[PDB]
Design an enzyme around this catalytic site. Sequence first.
Site, PDB file in Angstrom:
ATOM      1  N   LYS B 249      33.669  22.200  48.615  1.00 13.97           N
ATOM      2  CA  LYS B 249      32.330  22.719  48.374  1.00 13.97           C
ATOM      3  C   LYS B 249      32.361  24.242  48.376  1.00 13.97           C
ATOM      4  O   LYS B 249      32.897  24.863  49.299  1.00 13.97           O
ATOM      5  CB  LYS B 249      31.358  22.203  49.433  1.00 13.97           C
ATOM      6  CG  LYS B 249      29.895  22.479  49.109  1.00 13.97           C
ATOM      7  CD  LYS B 249      28.964  21.512  49.832  1.00 13.97           C
ATOM      8  CE  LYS B 249      27.567  21.526  49.226  1.00 13.97           C
ATOM      9  NZ  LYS B 249      26.683  20.481  49.819  1.00 13.97           N
ATOM     10  N   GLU B 324      18.168   6.379  55.388  1.00 16.06           N
ATOM     11  CA  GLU B 324      16.779   6.371  55.839  1.00 16.06           C
ATOM     12  C   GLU B 324      16.401   5.034  56.467  1.00 16.06           C
ATOM     13  O   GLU B 324      15.699   4.994  57.484  1.00 16.06           O
ATOM     14  CB  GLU B 324      15.852   6.692  54.664  1.00 16.06           C
ATOM     15  CG  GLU B 324      15.760   8.176  54.330  1.00 16.06           C
ATOM     16  CD  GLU B 324      16.820   8.634  53.339  1.00 16.06           C
ATOM     17  OE1 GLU B 324      17.625   7.796  52.873  1.00 16.06           O
ATOM     18  OE2 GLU B 324      16.845   9.842  53.025  1.00 16.06           O
ATOM     19  N   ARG B 352      11.880   5.138  51.023  1.00 12.62           N
ATOM     20  CA  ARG B 352      13.076   4.304  51.044  1.00 12.62           C
ATOM     21  C   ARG B 352      13.232   3.520  52.342  1.00 12.62           C
ATOM     22  O   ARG B 352      14.045   2.589  52.389  1.00 12.62           O
ATOM     23  CB  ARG B 352      14.322   5.164  50.817  1.00 12.62           C
ATOM     24  CG  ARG B 352      15.569   4.359  50.480  1.00 12.62           C
ATOM     25  CD  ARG B 352      16.746   5.257  50.125  1.00 12.62           C
ATOM     26  NE  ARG B 352      16.694   5.718  48.743  1.00 12.62           N
ATOM     27  CZ  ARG B 352      17.734   6.202  48.076  1.00 12.62           C
ATOM     28  NH1 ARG B 352      18.930   6.300  48.636  1.00 12.62           N
ATOM     29  NH2 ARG B 352      17.572   6.593  46.816  1.00 12.62           N
TER      30      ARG B 352
HETATM   31  C1  LIG Z   1      18.924  18.535  47.914  1.00 12.40           C
HETATM   32  C2  LIG Z   1      19.018  16.989  47.971  1.00 12.40           C
HETATM   33  O1  LIG Z   1      18.250  16.321  47.373  1.00 12.40           O
HETATM   34  C3  LIG Z   1      20.128  16.387  48.846  1.00 12.40           C
HETATM   35  S1  LIG Z   1      21.797  16.654  48.633  1.00 12.40           S
HETATM   36  C4  LIG Z   1      22.323  15.721  49.950  1.00 12.40           C
HETATM   37  C5  LIG Z   1      23.749  15.484  50.401  1.00 12.40           C
HETATM   38  C6  LIG Z   1      24.772  15.721  49.293  1.00 12.40           C
HETATM   39  O2  LIG Z   1      25.964  15.155  49.742  1.00 12.40           O
HETATM   40  P1  LIG Z   1      27.067  14.672  48.625  1.00 12.40           P
HETATM   41  O3  LIG Z   1      28.397  14.484  49.307  1.00 12.40           O
HETATM   42  O4  LIG Z   1      26.632  13.380  47.978  1.00 12.40           O
HETATM   43  O5  LIG Z   1      27.168  15.840  47.468  1.00 12.40           O
HETATM   44  P2  LIG Z   1      27.857  17.319  47.699  1.00 12.40           P
HETATM   45  O6  LIG Z   1      26.762  18.350  47.814  1.00 12.40           O
HETATM   46  O7  LIG Z   1      28.727  17.630  46.509  1.00 12.40           O
HETATM   47  O8  LIG Z   1      28.697  17.309  48.955  1.00 12.40           O
HETATM   48  C7  LIG Z   1      21.149  15.209  50.550  1.00 12.40           C
HETATM   49  C8  LIG Z   1      21.191  14.281  51.816  1.00 12.40           C
HETATM   50  N1  LIG Z   1      19.989  15.583  49.928  1.00 12.40           N
HETATM   51  C9  LIG Z   1      18.650  15.127  50.437  1.00 12.40           C
HETATM   52  C10 LIG Z   1      18.440  13.579  50.268  1.00 12.40           C
HETATM   53  C11 LIG Z   1      18.144  12.798  51.373  1.00 12.40           C
HETATM   54  N2  LIG Z   1      17.965  11.489  51.202  1.00 12.40           N
HETATM   55  C12 LIG Z   1      18.055  10.923  50.008  1.00 12.40           C
HETATM   56  C13 LIG Z   1      17.837   9.397  49.868  1.00 12.40           C
HETATM   57  N3  LIG Z   1      18.333  11.638  48.934  1.00 12.40           N
HETATM   58  C14 LIG Z   1      18.525  12.954  49.026  1.00 12.40           C
HETATM   59  N4  LIG Z   1      18.827  13.721  47.831  1.00 12.40           N
END
Ligand SMILES: CC(=O)c1sc(CCOP(=O)(O)OP(=O)(O)O)c(C)[n+]1Cc1cnc(C)nc1N
Lengths: 567, 573, 567
Positions: B249, B324, B352
């Site tokens: 990242k 969630e 959710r």
């Molecule tokens: C801003 C937003 O919506 C993000 S990005 C992210 C984690 C990203 O982790 P991932 O490993 O999948 O990708 P990465 O950034 O490349 O490491 C979360 C929890 N959220 C908030 C969130 C919370 N809960 C749910 C169901 N969806 C989202 N999008």
Amino acid sequence: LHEIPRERPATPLLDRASSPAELRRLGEADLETLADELRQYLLYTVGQTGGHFGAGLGVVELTIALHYVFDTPDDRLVWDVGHQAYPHKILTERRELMGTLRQKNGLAAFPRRAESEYDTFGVGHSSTSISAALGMAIAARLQGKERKSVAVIGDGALTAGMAFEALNHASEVDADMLVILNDNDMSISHNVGGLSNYLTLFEELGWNYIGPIDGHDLPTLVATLRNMRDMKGPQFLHVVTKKGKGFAPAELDPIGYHAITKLEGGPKYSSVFGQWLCDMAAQDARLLGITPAMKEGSDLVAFSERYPERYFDVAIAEQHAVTLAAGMACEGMKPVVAIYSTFLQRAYDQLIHDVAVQHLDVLFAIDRAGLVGEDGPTHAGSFDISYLRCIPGMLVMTPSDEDELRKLLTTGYLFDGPAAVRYPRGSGPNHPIDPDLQPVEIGKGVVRRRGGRVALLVFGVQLAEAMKVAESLDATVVDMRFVKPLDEALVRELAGSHELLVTIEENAVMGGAGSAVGEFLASEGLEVPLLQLGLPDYYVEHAKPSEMLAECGLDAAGIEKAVRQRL
Amino acid sequence: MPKTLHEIPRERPATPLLDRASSPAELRRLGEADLETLADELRQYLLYTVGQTGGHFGAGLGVVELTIALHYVFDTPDDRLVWDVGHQAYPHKILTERRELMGTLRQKNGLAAFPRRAESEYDTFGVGHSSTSISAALGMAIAARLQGKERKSVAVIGDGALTAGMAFEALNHASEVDADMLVILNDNDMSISHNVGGLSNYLAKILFEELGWNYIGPIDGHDLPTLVATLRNMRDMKGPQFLHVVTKKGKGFAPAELDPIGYHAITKLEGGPKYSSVFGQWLCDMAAQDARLLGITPAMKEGSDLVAFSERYPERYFDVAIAEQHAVTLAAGMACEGMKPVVAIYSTFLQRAYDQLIHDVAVQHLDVLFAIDRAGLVGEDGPTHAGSFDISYLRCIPGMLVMTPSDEDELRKLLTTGYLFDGPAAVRYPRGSGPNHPIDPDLQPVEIGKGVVRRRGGRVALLVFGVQLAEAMKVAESLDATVVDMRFVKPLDEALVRELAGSHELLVTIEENAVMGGAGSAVGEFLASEGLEVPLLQLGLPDYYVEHAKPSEMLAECGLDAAGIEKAVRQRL
Amino acid sequence: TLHEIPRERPATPLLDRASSPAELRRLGEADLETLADELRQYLLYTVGQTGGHFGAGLGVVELTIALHYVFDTPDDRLVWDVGHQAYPHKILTERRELMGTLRQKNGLAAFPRRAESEYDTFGVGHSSTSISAALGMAIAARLQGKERKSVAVIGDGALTAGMAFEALNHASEVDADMLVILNDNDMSISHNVGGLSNYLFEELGWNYIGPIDGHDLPTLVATLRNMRDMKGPQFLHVVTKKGKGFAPAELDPIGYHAITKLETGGPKYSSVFGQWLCDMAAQDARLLGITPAMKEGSDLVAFSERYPERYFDVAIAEQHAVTLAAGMACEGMKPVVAIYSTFLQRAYDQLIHDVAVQHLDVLFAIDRAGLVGEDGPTHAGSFDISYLRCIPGMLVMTPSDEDELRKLLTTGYLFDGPAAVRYPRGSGPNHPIDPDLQPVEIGKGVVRRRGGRVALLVFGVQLAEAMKVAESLDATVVDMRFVKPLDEALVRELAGSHELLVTIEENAVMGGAGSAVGEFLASEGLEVPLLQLGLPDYYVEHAKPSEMLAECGLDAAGIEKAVRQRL
Ligand SMILES: CC(=O)c1sc(CCOP(=O)(O)OP(=O)(O)O)c(C)[n+]1Cc1cnc(C)nc1N
Ligand SMILES: CC(=O)c1sc(CCOP(=O)(O)OP(=O)(O)O)c(C)[n+]1Cc1cnc(C)nc1N
Ligand SMILES: CC(=O)c1sc(CCOP(=O)(O)OP(=O)(O)O)c(C)[n+]1Cc1cnc(C)nc1N
Ligand SMILES: [Ca+2]
Ligand SMILES: [Ca+2]
Ligand SMILES: [Ca+2]
Ligand SMILES: [Ca+2]
Ligand SMILES: [Ca+2]
Ligand SMILES: [Ca+2]
Ligand SMILES: [Ca+2]
Ligand SMILES: [Ca+2]
Ligand SMILES: [Mg+2]
Ligand SMILES: [Mg+2]
Ligand SMILES: [Mg+2]
Ligand code: NA
Ligand code: NA
């Protein structure tokens, strides 16, 4: 199934059912496994060779049931059109020949009497099955034979007038025959017409009507067919099938899977026509477009979508298409009849009597002119120059490429009277297409090359091949454009200044455009040698279009040999 | 040797090769030996454009090479590519005909925050909520197979999004139907915070092979020669395929590599506390007074602001990953033993866990507090994250205490009230900061089901449910209206509503929630049941999805500023 | 007919009774169609076990049976052209049970071979020698008064070669008693091109019979019996289908020309060349690509699809390919002749007289340089360094890996004059390839390793093995790149700083690259010891490429042993 097999599938039961006699030795509990194996082999082999696809999948079970119940080939089975008859061929001693399907010297595209005793009637044009079956039934009765007669006809083929004539006569003679309506609510395009809406009239016409039944329930098919086989008089079985049954991609897109190419240039002339039709309709609100159930083939697709109120699919009713145009022209509208050369044979009387005799303003766009390739002789557009040019009032045109087609379509349309423009299947030399909509002068050829001793008078798309020959021989080449009226002035000039006139057309030499030139030369007392090149006086066996043209001598090599042999 | 960039470019960087890859078709005309130069240029442009507009940052940098390799090897847009969440899809947008539109990113009428089907044919699935990619790509693959289109289907899912139950459900179903699809695990050992969970522990060790998946990897997600070669081999493989890719990242930008949490998103280059910070302070304050308090978040410690709480009370802080559903049922179990769980969850993400809230908490009348952040319109993230419905979907659930604080002091007070209440309670509040009113430092509840008259007037009564109170006070000045800080949607202050219905000519309800089923309709239902015949004007969010823009711009569009409220009341009178 | 290759030895009781032509000739005509089926079963099976040529042999199963049934072999002389189609011949001439050793070390050879069997009259491999050889036997037999028959079976592809034209003309002149059988399947390896294929003898003084069906055993036996006793030059035109009896081969005759035995590296050098040819053609409209019927092997596939107007398949006509290139270069075009080292020896005179004597701008891309493996010594590219380096004006280059091949093709291409780049069949060490198109300095090697005492001067792909040896001996290693012009300055330096110079090449030691070094050392009076490693002065028996290289001592172990013993 979801994918076409690329390797031969294992079909142990189908392999034991190579003929109907063998099939009938199997047990009923085996037929549904056989149906699966047949469907798999069908997918495999049509994937190998290309050919008609969806309609045959729809009759896999019906075909099995028919040969299981009826004593074929003693009992007579007539398939309408025959594009759905690959399962029929697979079960009649031709499974291991399907690798040759639609190939030179291989199995034909449709059932054919000369191909197998199991093919009672050569078909290709639609709606002949009932008439043929009734003739066999009548003959068998008079001969004291006890054979059955069966005709399988699709809901689209049933829209033709000759099927109605046959149903009416069979009742009159109280013939012992069975008509099976294979109703999948489809033609090539969707079946549009007052009869498809209806799908009893059959009862009121003297037929015993049974159905509708599930055309894919083998147990019900065998039991029903068994019951009606020995019933007497005209019997009518209404069967319901799904086009493409058992191959989901075809069920989901029955148009695109009506036929497929074997698994692994410029625009098609039909596409040039389709664009012209849209362009002219955009400029003239009077233009109306008519097709007899061939929107996709003649390419009225875009036109139908853009001008739905001026587009008319009359189902498989070539006759009505032409007389309907005549009536439209009487009110000042401008109908264009899109029709294949081979199918216009069925509306000849309407063209002569309702259009030509009245000199009504109707344009005929004649596709599939000449040799059509793998579909074979039943669909060849071999005769339209001959059978149209003898009709007074007809303007008969033969474009040599894409731009010429657009121009002559415009010329025929602007002409106030009956006009015909003929062009082949496939694509052309891919010459630039003038976007304007301007006509050319009627009855005038165009000199494309000025040479010495030989003058090639080309009517149609052999121009490019004649140009190659003329460059080799240093010859004169004329793009004739019109069979009728003929450019007499130009023919007369070339007859005096050249030692040999050579006419070239993708039409029967007998009665063709070259004979129009011969008639002119004779009437004027001009005795220049004349070599007529064209289609011979037999039915050319199916092959690739290039192989059929080469056989007829209408490629550069054949043309040059003919010319030099004359000289 | 790879170079670490240390500053965000302030001027359009020179990217001659990126400019020749404006679309996947153009990219695929380039040579494989050019891709690593393209990757450097894409990084430079990415840093530059996000510095100009603000937005998501570190995730996109981590998938630059992966994005290049995917569009090089696959026949997009015919082959279907599904990005999970989509916050990492800026490189994707840059390579799919939107590079020169990145300057409008996350602005009104500009490019949206995430892939969007209506925005581009190269966007196969609108995302925002996480963990939908595998399910969506599976459905695409199943349909394409039945149709005979021989399409490829690819889902790119991060290690964080993979922690959600629905991703597990899709992985198991895909094995059942033997779908021809590719799942690319974008593993960087990060969520927003550090990815903390049992799945993260297992991924560090390396089954998907025990499920019906063919597992390949892990491979270096920043090694373009390897990525291209591997994707090429797997593109033509059949059945469920699972490629494990490891990325960093913030790759390429040293500050983001050092601080991946802080560089998950940034504001463009060159007031009172946020409501989330008011909640975080209350959580710490109550935890110091009550050993029973437990704090739960589904991977949003930073956004909901449990930061100080997690540091001060590590034994009482629970990040359940992006889960969630489990967060809510876990709270229910805790409440069964007499603990006092607080579930911090955004309004849009609580939908959710709706079934866990109803079936596990409310049906059992269990003592759980829901701190519902991001209630109302959220601004640039757009409609996929809007907190538009929580009043509507919670108020029909028997047993629920439903609260709408109007400022910072009210949020602290209503958090205490719902917390102390012996049963399920919900307190909703918006993103951002408030009017900056003084906050009482004590921890005392207020009377449940009673509003506060904040202005005595006549003729028109404004019944305000939440943070539009300050705007309604402005409108009341010219009309001499009375204004009620309702505090409670459920139980409703019925005695006050009955009084106002008898003494005024028009009742006006105001809420940052869908009018349909919202708090105004609770007022409407009460009036109907008592046969009270007073005109009612219900102001709130409309029955459509509000396009992304500044919060103030979205509120103005919906008529929830002083100007819009005044016009509505004026046009009714 | 058959769709899968048997994995277990099929039962062939009748084939097992026809182990020799004499035993075959005791069977009855009615048994031969069953014998043919048993032969195909065995052929498919054994080639599945060992690999080798496939389709062509299937096409002549019936022809082979008929020839040995009618003619009195081995007293009557049967000559197979090329011999890739002679597996059935071997199966019928006492080698059926030895087919398990086919193309393996110490097993049966890839082609007929006089030393292998009295039933093999002429060792073949290169094409189009059958008529000449059969004519020679017939002239000799006649002078000896032996009354034996002489028969040459030649394919339509092999017939495109000039030497076959020469043999047909001479045989007519001497009125020889011999039979030429044209095995016409309208195929080479790729599709057969050229005006001969388009035409498919009497005028050339031959009595022509046919065409006849080469899979109709009754017609074959009857026709051969009739012509066996006719006098003078007899010509029988037979039509066969390549891959007959195995559907996948009939569908894909190109892919089933040869198969691997039933059951990750870098690109084949031929693929590197094909990619270079496309890359350069995209930058330079002058590039033309020529192949004598080896599009697939030399890999002009992508080039022929993308640049069809600049691709030329001249049929099996190595001579014409080279002089054609000379003509194109006279007009300023940049022809590239792709040709195997072993086949280039048939165009040696055109290379010398038409190209090098005129110093014309022609690049020769010489594939299959060195040992070629199972195809054996008839196909070995053993001599091209020796027979090209003595020709004035020739640039002669020996790339050591994939990147060097691309670079040296560019170098020779841009060089204004004749240039040759040689490379082996198969793949290489898989080193990175620079995508650019830039030449390297002509006549300069690159030192790949600085060491002491012994210096390894490597011309070509043994560089990787030489680097291994240099690890244990701490030797200097030079990638010479050029045989001609030689890097004289570098050899001079090494001769004065080392105690032993070792040359390594995949070419005959006699006249090879090592001898160019010795020639320079001698002319300068440099008396440093010189050890020349390369191909020995005999024909290496077929085996795995790795086994033939080990036999010649051109692997690391063999090089190390030879260097240590010299030191
Ligand atoms: C801003 C937003 O919506 C993000 S990005 C992210 C984690 C990203 O982790 P991932 O490993 O999948 O990708 P990465 O950034 O490349 O490491 C979360 C929890 N959220 C908030 C969130 C919370 N809960 C749910 C169901 N969806 C989202 N999008
Ligand atoms: C390809 C060809 O010749 C077919 S198949 C077909 C419609 C088939 O509809 P049907 O319902 O009878 O059968 P189904 O495919 O099973 O639904 C047409 C109009 N055509 C062209 C055509 C046009 N007009 C006529 C007189 N005959 C034919 N054969
Ligand atoms: C052995 C080898 O490398 C083959 S097999 C073959 C095709 C010959 O076609 P033909 O029609 O004669 O036989 P068919 O397979 O039955 O169709 C070629 C060109 N080659 C390469 C080749 C090239 N050039 C020369 C002088 N000789 C050979 N053998
Ligand atoms: Ca008109
Ligand atoms: Ca034609
Ligand atoms: Ca001239
Ligand atoms: Ca940040
Ligand atoms: Ca509580
Ligand atoms: Ca206080
Ligand atoms: Ca505000
Ligand atoms: Ca370079
Ligand atoms: Mg139908
Ligand atoms: Mg992550
Ligand atoms: Mg051949
Ligand atoms: Na189709
Ligand atoms: Na092969």
